Structure formats: C-alpha cells, structure tokens
Amino acid sequence: RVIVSQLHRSPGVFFDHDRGKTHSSGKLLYSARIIPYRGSWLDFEFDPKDCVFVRIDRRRKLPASVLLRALGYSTEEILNAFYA
Amino acid sequence: VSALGPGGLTRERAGFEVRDVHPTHYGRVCPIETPEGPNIGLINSLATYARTNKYGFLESPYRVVKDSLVTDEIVFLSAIEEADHVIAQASATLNEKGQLVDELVAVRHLNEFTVKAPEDVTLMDVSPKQVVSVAASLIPFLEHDDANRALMGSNMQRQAVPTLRADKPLVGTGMERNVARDSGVCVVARRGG
Amino acid sequence: NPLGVPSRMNVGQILETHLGLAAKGLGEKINRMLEEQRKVAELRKFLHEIYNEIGGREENLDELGDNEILALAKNLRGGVPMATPVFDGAKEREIKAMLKLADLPESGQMRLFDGRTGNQFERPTTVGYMYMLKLNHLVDDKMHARSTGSYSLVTQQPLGGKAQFGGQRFGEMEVWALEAYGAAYTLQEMLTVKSDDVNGRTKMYKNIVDGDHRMEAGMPESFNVLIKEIRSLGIDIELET
Amino acid sequence: ARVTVEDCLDNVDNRFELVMLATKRARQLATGGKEPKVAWENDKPTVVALREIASGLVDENVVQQED
Amino acid sequence: EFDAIRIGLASPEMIRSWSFGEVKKPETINYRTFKPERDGLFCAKIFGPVKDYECLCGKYKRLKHRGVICEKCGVEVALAKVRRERMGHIELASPVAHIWFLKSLPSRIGLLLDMTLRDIERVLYFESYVVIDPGMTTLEKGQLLNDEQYFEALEEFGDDFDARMGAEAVHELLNAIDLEHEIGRLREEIPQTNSETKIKKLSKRLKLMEAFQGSGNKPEWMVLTVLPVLPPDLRPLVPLDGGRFATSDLNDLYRRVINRNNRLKRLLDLAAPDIIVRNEKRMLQEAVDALLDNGRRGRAITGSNKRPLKSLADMIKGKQGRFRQNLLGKRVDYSGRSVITVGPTLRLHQCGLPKKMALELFKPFIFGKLEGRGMATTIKAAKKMVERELPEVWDVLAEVIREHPVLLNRAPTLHRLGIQAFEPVLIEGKAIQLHPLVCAAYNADFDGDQMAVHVPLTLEAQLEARALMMSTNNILSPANGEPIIVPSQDVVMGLYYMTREAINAKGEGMAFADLQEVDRAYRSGQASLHARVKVRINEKIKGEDGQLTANTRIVDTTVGRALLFQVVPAGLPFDVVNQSMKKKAISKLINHCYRVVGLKDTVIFADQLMYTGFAYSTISGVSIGVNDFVIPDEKARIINAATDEVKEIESQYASGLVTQGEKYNKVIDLWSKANDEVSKAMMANLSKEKVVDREGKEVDQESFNSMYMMADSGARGSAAQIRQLAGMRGLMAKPDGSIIETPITANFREGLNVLQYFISTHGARKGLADTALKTANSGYLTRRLVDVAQDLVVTEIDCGTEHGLLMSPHIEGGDVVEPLGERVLGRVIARDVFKPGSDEVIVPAGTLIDEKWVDFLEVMSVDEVVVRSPITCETRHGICAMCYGRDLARGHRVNIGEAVGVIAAQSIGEPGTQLTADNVQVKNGGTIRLHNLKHVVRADGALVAVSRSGELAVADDFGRERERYKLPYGAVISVKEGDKVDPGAIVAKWDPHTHPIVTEVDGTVAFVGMEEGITVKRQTDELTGLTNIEVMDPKDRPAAGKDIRPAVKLIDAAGKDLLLPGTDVPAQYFLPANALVNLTDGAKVSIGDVVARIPQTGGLPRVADLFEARRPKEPSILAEISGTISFGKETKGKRRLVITPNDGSDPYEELIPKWRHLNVFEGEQVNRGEVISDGPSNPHDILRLLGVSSLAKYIVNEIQDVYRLQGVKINDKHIETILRQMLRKVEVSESGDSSFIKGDQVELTQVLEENEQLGTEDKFPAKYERVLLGITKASLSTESFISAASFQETTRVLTEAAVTGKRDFLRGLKENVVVGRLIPAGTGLAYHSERKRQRDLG
Amino acid sequence: VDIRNGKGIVDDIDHLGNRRVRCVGEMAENQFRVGLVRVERAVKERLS
RNA sequence: GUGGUGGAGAGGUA
DNA sequence: GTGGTGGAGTACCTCGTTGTGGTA
DNA sequence: TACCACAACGAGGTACCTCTCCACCAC
Ligand SMILES: [Mg+2]
User: Fold this and answer.
1) What is the domain extent for residue E656?
2) Going by C-beta distance under 8 Å and a sequence separation of 6 or more, which residues neighbour residue C39?
3) Dihedral over Cα of C219, C220, C222, C226: its sign
4) Is C5 within 8 Å of chain B by CB?
5) CB distance from A5 to chain B under 8 Å?
6) Which residue gives the smallest C-alpha to C1' distance to I4?
7) H24 C1' to E1101 CA distance, Å
8) Is E1009 helix (H, G, I), strand (E, B) or coil?
9) Hey, which family's this protein in (chain A)?
10) What phi and psi, each to the nearest 5 degrees, are found at residue E824?
11) Measuring from the CA of residue E445 to each C1', which nucleotide is nearest?
C-alpha cells in the first residue's frame, strides 16, 4: 500500500470578504476563521448592520464584546484600545 | 497529492475553487494530470520538480537572473515568496553568455501573464517540464495537444499493461530513463564493479 | 480513424506518427548498411550525421568503433529512439529534414494500396509508427451474463456482481424509457416475473422449457416487504380487494 | 419476407391492438388450435402471426371465430 | 385480485391482531446452541419454522399435517416462508410518543393539541407538568408548570387539579380531545376573527379534525402503547466464514429497546425512585425514537464504527436515497453486458452477439428445444452437451436465436432511443457488435462503452419489441420529427467526397446512357470519381399520389453523384443528390424520403447509403497530416500589427494618459478584432486553396484539403476548432471569468509555450469540472420532470374544445427566428383559416397539419394561426389525441395509450448535458404597421407615444410582419403607416435616456410650488450646459420644502385651466427630484412636451427556475386593473398609487415600497396587463392577471430561448404538456360546495360544478382561480400518495397519508409499476379498460 | 476592522501557500500522538 | 422429496 | 463466554422551502 | 400587526468494474 500526501488547509487565520446574498445587500466584509492544528475553530462573524459577532465552531452568533470581557479587557479599555 | 480524507474537503463540498487550477499551481502541482470523474481536481499530482518546504508548503526551482546575465544559481521558492519577483519562462533568447537578447519577454509579475523587458526579470524557470506531472511529461509533442486530451492521455498511460516483450517507444521525452530508474522495478548497481 | 483528430484537438498523434515513420526508416537504413557489411567508419560518420543535424549533441569519437558502434548499430537496427522534450521538443522542420534524410516522402504521406482491391487510394495517406498501448480493460473480465441464479434473501432479486453471476439493474431511467414506448407487457414481465417473483420464476421456467411463453403475473415480494416494514412503522396498510 | 409492421400498423392505425391480435394469433399457433392461413416460410409463430395480420387475412372477427 | 391500497394509523388492538407474539427476550439465535430462544427476536413460537414443516423437538417430522401445533413443540408446524409475513409486538412498560408525527415540519400532535412543540418536548422529557382535569381550580388544562410550581399548586388545590408528566400525559390528552366538540369550537371561532394568520391556523385545525373524523382515525393511537416487530427474514443476520456474524441495524435497535423495556418493568415492579424511573422512561423514549427513525434528534451510532445506524426510515427510503432501488430498480435476470464493437456488415434491424452470452442467456430455451427434438432426454444430459458445446447445440442455438428479438440499452438512458430492440446475430468473440447508425441515438462511441443486453420472454414482449422497439421502428426523434438514425462521421465523409466536383478531372464532359454505364466506366478506372459529366437517368416521380411517374432526363452532373443516385429509392427526384451532400443535406434528404416513399424503403435506403458511404470513404485516401493545417501568410503580419498596437497602447497607459480599466477593454477589443481577422483570412485561404488548370488557363476551385472536407462536410469538427488548430487561439478566460489580457498567438500545429498551455489548462479544467455538475443537475431535473408528468397519457380521442393558442412564427429581433410552418408542423388546427380577405375558409377545422398543408400555408400569406394544445383538451384524467399534435416518432397521429408525458419529460430533459437601444432601426424594406399603438399626434405630427404598450411591425409586401419592434414610452415616430420604408431607416426616433414626462395638453403652464431650494433649484451646468431648474429632493429639500412638491398647474396660454380627458383634475403631474424642466414656467408647450426627465441567467439553472416558477428576488411590478394611475405617498415609504378606472373606479391599489425603484409615471393609463415598474417577469401574476395562454406562451418562449441558444431543437408539444401538468390544480374563492380556499384538482372543480348546476342550487356552483404549481410542488400534491412517496419527502407524504387516512386507487403509471401490474398506458390500456369495465359496471 | 475599513485585502484560498501538502510522516505522528494521549490518560488513571 | 450476501472505505470505466 | 452497554472529538456545501419569534 | 432575519429540513446522475475490511468486556 501507499500513503497519498494529503493537501489540506494550513492552520492559521483566514479573512474572507466573499460577496454573498446572505446580507440581501451589496456585499459584506465577511467573517474570519482561525483554524488550529488541533482544537476548536473560533469564528468572528460580521453582522450586516456594521456589527461583529463571535462564535465557537459549534455555537450560535454572539457579540465580540462577550469575548473581549472574558479576555479581561474593560468595556471601555477595550473600546479605547480598538476603536481609537 | 490529494485533498480528500481527514481534515479535507469531501466530494459533497466540491464547489469550484478547490477543483480549479490557479497561477499559484505553476510548477508545483501538475495542472493537467487529474482523474476525470467525480474526483476531478480534488486529487492531483505534483510537478516534476516539486518540493515540500520546511513548513510543508510547496517550493519550486528557479534560476536567479541578473538584469542582463542569467546567474547559474538555483533557488527553490514557495508561492508566497514568488510575489515580488518577476518570473520569466524557461525558454527565451540568450546571447550565448547568459544575456537575454529578447526585447519583450513574457513574464509573470504577481501571477498574471504578460511580456516584460529583460532588464526587469528577476527569476526564470528551470525546465519547461517543471509544470507537468511525471506521466504528463512522458507524452511527446505535448505542446501540440489540447489540455483535455493531455489529461486523458496521462490517465490511460497510467493504466497500461506490460506486454509479453516490451519495446521501447521510438518517440520519447527523455524522462523514461529517469522514471525507470526511480521506480524500483529495475535492478540497480548499489556499488560499481 | 482520421476523423477523430480534428474534433479532439490533439495533433500529437500526427507528429508522433511522422517522427516514428522517420525513426523506423532510419532503423531499416542502418540495418541495410549493417547487412552491407559496411566498415565501422561509414556507420560512425552516418551516425554523426544523424546526431549533428538539429538538437541535443553527439558524443561519438569517444566510443570504440568495433565494439561500441557495432553494439549501438545492432541495438538501433530496430529503429532509432527519438527523444523529444515536452516543450523543448522537435520542431516540424527538424522532422522534415530527418525524413528527407531517411529517404522517406517529405510530406509524411504516401499513396497506399488497398489490400483487397489492389487499387491505390487516390489521395496519399498518413502512415508511420505510433506507440500504441493496451489498457487493463480486457473484455474477458467484462463479459458477464446471467440466465438465473441466486437472489438476495431480503428481496428475491439477482445479486449485482459479475463475480456473483448477477443481473444488471433496470434502473428507474430504464423503466421510464420502457414506458415511453407503449411496451408494457415486457415492462411488467421484467418487473415481476424476470425478477422478484418466487412463484413466477419457477413456473415461467416450466413454461419456457415447455416452449410456452404465458407468464402468469404474480405479485412481487419486494412490495410485500415494503408493506411489512410500513406496517411495522405502525401504519395500517391493506388492499380493498 | 419480413414483418410488415409499418403498413399493417397504418391499417389498424393503432400499433397496439395490432400487438394484441398478434399475440392471440401467435398463441393460437403455439397451441396448435389453428393453421397458418399463410404458408410457412420456416419461422416462429410471432412472425407468421405478423404476416397473417399484415396480409389482412385475419382480424378480430377471424381471431374470435377461430377461438 | 385486489385494488385501492389504503393508509391508516395503527390501533394497538389491530396491532396485536397483526402480532403473532410478544417478544420478551432481546437476545436472538444462540451461537452456542444453534437455535433461536423462546421470546427472542426469532422465536419459532411467534414467527414460524426454521426448516419447512418441522417442529421444535422434531416430534412431527411428517409433512402430512401442515398446520398442526405439537404438544411439546408448541410452535405450529407450517411452511418455512411464513417467517416473512408473521410479525410480533412488544408490550411497552409505558406509552411512547411517535417521532414522525412529532418531528415532521407541522407537529401533528402539537396541531391537535393547539400549542407549540416546545411544550410537548418539555413534557415528553418530564421537564414540566401539565394540568389534567383542572376542574374548579386556579389551574387550567393547557397550563404547564415546574416542580416548585407543582408543589405549590398541589398545596393550594390539593385535588381536582391533576398534574401529569411524560408521554402518558400526552396519551391522556389525546383521548380527552372531544374531536366533535373541538371541531365545532374551531368552526365557530374561524370566522369570528378576520386576522389572516389566526384564521389560517384555525383552518388547519379544522382540516385535521375533519380528516380524523371522516377517516375514523383515533388520535389516541398516535402515541403507541405497543409497537410491531419486523419479521426476522427482512431483518436477517448473516454469519460469515470463520465464525463471524453480521447483524442488521434493526436487530441492534430491537435488542436495545427490548433491553430498556425489561429494565423499566423490573425497576417498576419494585417501585424504583421516581427520578430513576423517569430517567429510564426517557431513555426508552429515545431508544424507540432511534429505532423507528434516526438522525432526527439523537443521531444514534453503532459500536466501534462511525457509520450511523440505519433505522427504519432508511429502509422505507430504499437505496439511492428516495429512489427505491428494490421497488423500481429491481436487477433483472436474463441480462448481460459487454463492450461494443462497430459492425458495418450489420443490417439495421440486426445486431451482433457473442456465442457465450447467447448460450448463457437463452439457456432455458436451449433446454426446451433439446428436450423437444430428442437429443435431450434428461436435463443432466442437456447440461452435459451445453457445457461441452457439441456441434449439435449450435444448430438449436441458432434456431432459437433466429427470430427472437433481443433488447439492448446503454448505461445513461436519456430517452426511449437509449434502449432499443434488435434481432441478434451470432458472432465469435466477447464483444457486442453494434450498428454504426444507431450509435448516435445511444450516444455511444466505441471508446470503451459497455452495452447492457436483455431478452424478452413472452410472445407479448417479443412482439412489443419487434413492433414497437425494433431499431427500424424508431427512426425519427421523439423530441422532434428530425430523423435520428443519421449518417455519422465516416459515412458522411464518404458521401461528401463522392459528391464533389473537380474542375479538370479525367472523363469530364462525356455522357452516359445509364447509371450502370457510369459505374462500369468508373470501376474500370477510366473515369474520375468526380468529373462534370452528362447522363440520362430514369427518375420515378410521385408528384401525384397513386401514380409513380417515371421520366428520363439528360443531366449535367458529376460521376460520384450519379453513382450515389442508384441507391436512392424510386420516389425522389434526382436533383436532391446533385448538390454537395453535406450532413444537413443528408438529414433533410432522409427526412424527405421517409415522408414520401415510406419506412421499409427508407431503412433500405439508409442501409444502402451507409454501405456506399463506408465503401467510398475507404476508397478515398482521406487522411490527416501536418501539412493539412495551413497557416495563412498574413497571420504573421497581423500578429506583428497587433503587437505593435498593443505596445503603443501600453506605452500610452504607462505615460498615464490612458487609464488601466479603459486600456484593458481597448486591448481585449484589439485582440478580438485581430483574432477575427486572422480566422476570416485563414478560412478564406483554406476554402479556396485550390488552383487547377483546365486545358490552358489555370483556375481556382473549392479546396480538397482533407481537414477542409472534415470541416465543411460537417462530418466532424467546427470552425472554432479550425481556429485553434490552424490559427491563433484567441483569448483565454481566467477562473474569475475574466478574459486574460494576453492571448495565445500560437496554434496547435505551431505548438504552445508553457504559459499559454497553462492558461488553456484553466479553460479545459473549467469545462471538465463543470461537466459532472451539469450532468448531475440535468439528471435531477429530468427525474423531477418524469415524476411530475408520468401519469399523463393520451386517453381520449377528441375533446372537441374550440380553444387553442394563437401561435405565430418566432420573429424576435429584426430577423425571422423560426418560420411559422416549422412551428405548426405536426399540429392540428383550432379554428378556421382565412385568406387575407376574410370569409375565405382556407383550412376548415381541426385537420392535422402535414407537409402538404404546411406547403399550402406557405403558398398563402398565412402568418397567425390558433392550434389545439394540451393546455386545451379539457378531458378529465388524460389528454385527447387531437389537442396533442402528430406523434413525433411516427408520421401518423398519436394513438390512445401513448405515454406522452414520459416522452415529453425525456425529450425535455435529454439535452440537459449540452447546456451550461435608443431609436427604432428598421432592418429591411417593408410596409409599416402599428400594433397596440395609442398616442396623439404632436404639433408637427411627430406622434410621440408616451404609452408603454406599443409595438412596430414592418409588414412584408405579402402582408406578413417580417420583423417587429417594441416602441418605448415617449417615442417620436415618422408615421407613414403602410408606406414602404427603405432598409436601415430609423422610422421612430425615440431617445429616452431618462423618464420623460409627456404633456398631451397645450398652453402656458403654471409651475406652482416650484420653490428654488425647497422644491426646485435653478442649477445650471458648466459652459451654459443647461438653462433649467432642478427639483429639490424630498430629503435634500428644506424641512418645510420636504413636504413641498412642485406642481405645474395645467393652464392654457391665456390662463384657461386645462384638465385631462376622463378625469376632471388638470394633468398637473408633480415634478419630483432628478427631473428636468427646461421649458420656462408660463411658456406654452405643444402636445407631447417632455415636462420632466428622470434618468433610469441561462442554462440549466434558468430552465429549472422556470419549471419551478420561483419568484425572483425583485419581480417586475405589474399593473392590476386598467384606468387612471396616481402617485405614490413616499411619506409612509410605500408608494401608494391609487387606480381610478374610467368604466368603474376601483380604488384598491397596493403601495409599492420605495426601496425598489419604480419607473411608473403618475396620472397615466393603468393598462391592467402592463408593467408598473420594470424587473424580471414573474409567472404567477401573469397567470392570475394576464391569463393562461399568455403565461404558456411566455414560459415556452423563455425556455426555447435557452434551448435555441445551444442550437438544440425540441418540439413545443413537450414543454406545453409539462405546462398542462403544472396547472392541474385550481384554487377556490367562493365554493358553496367546498372550503372557501383550497388548492384542488380542476377535475374535482369541474365535476362538482357540473353536479351542482343540475343539482341542489345554481348558487352552489363554485368560483375558483387557476393556480400554478412548480413541478416538485405539483408532483408531491398528486391524488395518489404512492407516487409522491416514491419521489421525495417520503416521511412527510407518508405522514400526510397516515393522518388523512388516504386510499390510493392505482390509476397512475408508477403505482402500477411498483405493484407489478401492467401499465395503464401502452398495451396494458386494453387490460385496464376491461378491468374498469368489469369493476364499475357491477 | 482594518479589512472592513479598507486597510488591507482579504485572503485568497487559491494560493498554494494558503494550502499545504502533508506526508506520511505527518499523519503517522498524528496517529502516534493520539494513541499516546490515550495510553497517557490510562496510565494517569492507573499511576495515581 | 433439498439448494448458498450486509455495510464502509478507496480507486477506475462509460 | 455470556450477559451488558455509556461519552472527548468534531465543526470546512448550496440552494430552496418552510416555519418562527422580533419589530414597525 | 404584516414583513423579516434566522434556523432547520430536504433535495442534490445514471450503470458497471477492481481492492481491503468489518463491537468490546471479562470473572
Ligand atoms: Mg464512450
């Protein structure tokens, strides 16, 4: 027998802005995916109404503020670091 | 090199992106050697000079060229590192001293195909066969056959049957010696004597 | 068939055929000077003429005449093996020059003679030597055939393998094609008595060996299997008689 | 000759009832209960039945009466 | 016999009636003791005997008593097969909920209990209680509560408030439903509320209650107390060599559920803790769920294998998903297969056959014959001779083969020609010899195709094959009358080569007395095959029917054509072969001969023609060499010019004067033009590449380059392929669909660079990848089509309806796309046909249009006709034979019993694989005529037409419209109606570029409310580009100016108020934003003045979208009722333009949200059928507003556009038949005899209306609206549930049948298929007719 | 947020750089690691 | 008076 | 050999309906 | 209160050929 070399996606971060009719509008700078070599994949969705949603691989859309607060950044410190 | 299997796309997630050739496949994955049928493009074959990187990506050989002279040094390069360099086709006019004499030479700056000036080229390929597969390299006059028929020709070449008394093809691509040696079916002198 | 060339745009057949004709001509030629008991010098100079023509490079005069050249000619007597790279390969004019060197017709085409009528074909045809392969698709393992045999225990239907002496499946598209014709008796036959009728297959065997073709209809057991499983799904199923 | 399945199909203008009567005639042949009013040319009951109907010498009345 | 298969729910009583036992032991057969266990999954007490006619202890080994039950051996002695019918039950410790009725999209139990499935899911898992018998307490029946609330409620109430939890609570709810009382309450409540959603829910409740009451079904049976067990044979476990056993999934599921039930009973009898007992109840509920279905909730898995367990629903689905392999596929005996091989020595009706396949297939026939003639006395001897193959067996084998037709089919059968009958011929080999002409029908090349064989056994089947499926019978395509047994590549090459002319050839100019003389001269070799010669010939002409007129005529022809004519039958003029005989010419000649001479002679001609084509192609030394591809000398110069130009353009871009985007388009245009020039030059070079000398001066003639005949003859190849072969290959396209800015200058003879090959690889891989997905999509589409139209069969002979379709030649564009005669061929008329002068009956009535009649119509100036269609033919349950046109595979009219629906579906779906403006400019010189034109002449007579509906037709001198043009709103036209306009004239000078606001009134207007900044703005462009005032936007205006709208009050020049005709208000249309009022306020404007100016896929997906009639994302907004239109109120955000019809003002006019742009002009004629705002065209609103025939025409044109784009030809009969299948259902508005709103079969409506007319009251007759259904939707809504069950949604449709208690009378094709009965259509029509006769009549 | 705001460009999975080819060693090591963690948890349960 | 194949995976042909 | 049976590793289509809880 | 985003179900081509490989535990 022989083992055929598998060509697969390299683990890491990937940013997608593929236009889709999901927004029913022009386009969306779509989500980004971080893929681990082993573990869960975190997804950072971008809501059509200029909002950022974050979910685990098998979890529903949740706002990124939850993840920011869980990371320990303050609701204002995180904003001051990111938005400004 | 296949794309199915664990951690890989199934045949129900085919789409088109995985099943299509991109300029980044140049010299790394054979663009024409792949089985026609349900698994097309999903399961491909490496180029003749293909090479995995330390990081597992694909690297391809090229000769560094000075603005005039073609330096004999040879470098293996991955797709991401090919962006800056302007790559010239392996066949081009030469001044018998390494100087590209053509005025407008076909090149690829950032994976788009156009002509350029010899003063602008930075890398140029090793051999024209560095794009096709091993089976794809074995069809003579391949430059005169369309891509579909090349694919089928490779595929049936993969399914030949050894005859009672094999006879060497009168027309060959020179690669037959290489593949014959590389396959273990031939007894090879481990030590000279 | 030449007509397969222009549609499937692969000219490599024609160029390969021409070059192979040239190669075989050269092989026969060197065979004749070898049979003419030519001295080694003639063979060496002719070979150099071959290898100085267009591309690659000769390496002779580094080979001992009587040993190396004679062995090479003996091996080459069956035809000179050409080596053409995928894209750095032989140009058309190179093949043409070799052909005229091979004393063969320049255009690579000659008028042939019919092998039965003896009449020469009016137009010259392309002939030559082409590397032909035989694939692992021989009919000996493809010819399956079934009259009757074992059937699946669940549904009394022929097994599906040539290995299992199985019968082909008359897929749903086949039955559509059948009903597109007005042919319904054959459809009912192949649906019921040719397959999935325990009490029909035996009796039509009796009829056939008796020479009668009557084919009592019967009732497929696959449908009653569906009935049984639907009933096991807690769904009442019955016929109004 | 051969089966005149085209001209006879136009006479009845059905090409289905033709098959029906043909089946009954061939069964009459196989059962031996009747004679081929067409002279046999060494062939099986189906084709002789097709010739019988094609020549117009047998029809629904003829089949029923011969029954 | 039997009939009328039923569906019902399982009553535990009748379940036990079914059951032969109560399985209590989860374990099955003992491996150690080779026996099943009492109360096991295979217990003989329940299911029957292992070996036939035996008892457990073997006490009764005798076969005499086949029904007795022994004393020690309790299990009754009986036949062994009874293990397949006998079933058993399981007695459950608790009632458990059925999953299907719960997890189907409408939760049946939730619908019956009138609350959401969340609540029952809660209760099913013992999460919340529910009140039973609330009595006189604060609790209520629907109330559900938690543990703390439960304890509090028990404390406060104590009794008269029973709280329950679990599936048993649901069961107690079900039998306490008061179906009559609930139905009465729902009926009372339904009209009380006018809200749409609530009335919809109440309607569904009433439907369910009525179905239950009429069906006699008890809802309490929904939650089963006991469940049946599958008979052991259908769930067998098989052992393998080495002591391995392989058990079915159903056995594992049964073991699991029995285990859990035993757990429940034994923990229950000792009164286990309540938490533990409810937990076990829950796992038993989950286990029975997983048994009866899988993947819906839990997705149960097997042990040490990732493959999910295959539950019962997976069995009922069958293999291949829902397309039941066991039920419809059904592998067939007396079958075989092998690779094909071309047999050119084969007559059309015959095919080759390997000896071994023949002797294997016909083995019972061999046995019968051998026993008959006497060389076989025992069958062992017969087997002995057949295995040794004595020379004797070949004689009998040939005899049985002699007149036995054999049945052949390829793997992908896309139409009835994909499977054909042949008369086999024995050959020595292992391959199947095939007739070369039939390969086109099979679409089977000899590149390795395998061909499946079958043999018909009954005389019925053999006659069906010989008379209906013989290759000779089917010559013309069922899709279109064009022949399908047509000369292919090589024979076409031979024929074309024979029929050429050489300017100077041996023997030209000398004459022949007869064709035989020509053959004698040519075979002697003293005459060239193609030289201009004279020959007198004997042509038999059938110009008048009944007399075959023979005449002799001396003709100047070539030798080859004269030789060919000897093959042609005696019913055609010789002139039909005097031309070059290309492939299309050959097809036309074959079609002509078939319709003239007949069929037997037609096939004789076909075989002879093949023989001649093959022979003289063999004689011809036609061959391909590298010299054949000719590269024009000008190609190098053209390429150099293109390179120089593109280098100059690149330099210009680099200088910055040229932008990148414009440069890309410029260079691709340059390259395309250069490629076209190269292709044209090389084609001209090749075609005329022949210089010959004819007795002195050299001359030129048609080329004889081999590849040139390959192209021109049409045998093989195409101009595009020549372009790639001997010419520069043009632009290749990137994967994004963008054309690469650098082309491939080289051809294939020249060879390609690695880069150019790389790009060609992009293209080729694109095509190859798309191929498989296209095939899959086409397969799905054709399966849906055949399933939605399987039942439709020609049943009646003449409906007699006088409705048809006004059907005209395809004129789209400036040129005639499709001639009228070709469209009407094979159809039948629906009314009189008249001369241009009326009252002159040309074609009287429904007479079938034939070749004579189409030529007659061409003789006259017929342009528009109305033809009977299956959209007509109101006959119930079928289709009359007139409204469906002539049969396509037959020159004759269709016959009753022809499954046109299946034929139509196959024809439409077969070619799926092959798929993927200012002014009016007249084309030619013709008389100008106006259609649907409504406009008043301008002051100068410009006659600007602001009306939307209007078209311009350029009638020919005969009178027919050779072209038609659509006139846009606001089009100024040089109106000379009837005057011949020279070709290329621009008669109408429309130039919208904007939405102009016409002014049919005259005088000095008063632009009231035109505030400069609040409503208008005198903003002028640079260089005095305009002296105008631009209206202010409703948002960009001031806060008060936002509500201010400009209004040009219609005043005359002196001050007289002007008002629009019909309605008293002035034509003072508001001047919205982005308008252009260049006319000065108070300036008298002539009639038709532009007051305000407001500036404004294909392939299988398109046809699938049409066949589903899916609503586009933004459909074109269409008018409702004709009349006076109004303006929309943007304040609400939805433009409410009220309609004021003049005959009667109906204010009902919906408001279109401004999110979509509306191009409608306020205060105009509504034109009910017309479009208010542009966009893609929706189908349903055309059906409900424009009518039926209009919708059918639009759909047919839309589909045929896609099909004609690829050049594939299909008769409109098939698409129209599909359309008839779509519209089989109607919706009712006011019934008086049925529900208010119901999608019901139009047959039901017709029957009910006819009965009610001569019935109770004349007012009981119902008013209903026709409704359009997509094929997938329509097929699932068939009267017969079985067909939908075998199609898709098997769970859903089965649940509908169960809850509705449906009864299916097998009156469709697929039903008689699955049951194994004869087809209602075809030859089984007589059998079905007699069955109906004997059943209905006593 | 930069990509959404126009700073930078989206990634393209077409680039063979974004993909990677494994080799028998990689999946062999992965299977060995999986078996190793199973044996390790077994030992930790036992060697406690 | 008696007659012997599930599922998964992979590849290939048309 | 003959009773007896529960979760850390996996998530990577593509429409097209259909039903549902949210907001104007 | 009628649209509407969102989630779940349900479909996604025929036929044929070749190979290997098949629940654990556990006194
Ligand atoms: Mg083929």
Assistant:
1) 633-766
2) none
3) negative
4) no
5) yes
6) A24
7) 37
8) coil
9) Belongs to the RNA polymerase beta chain family.
10) -85, -5
11) G14
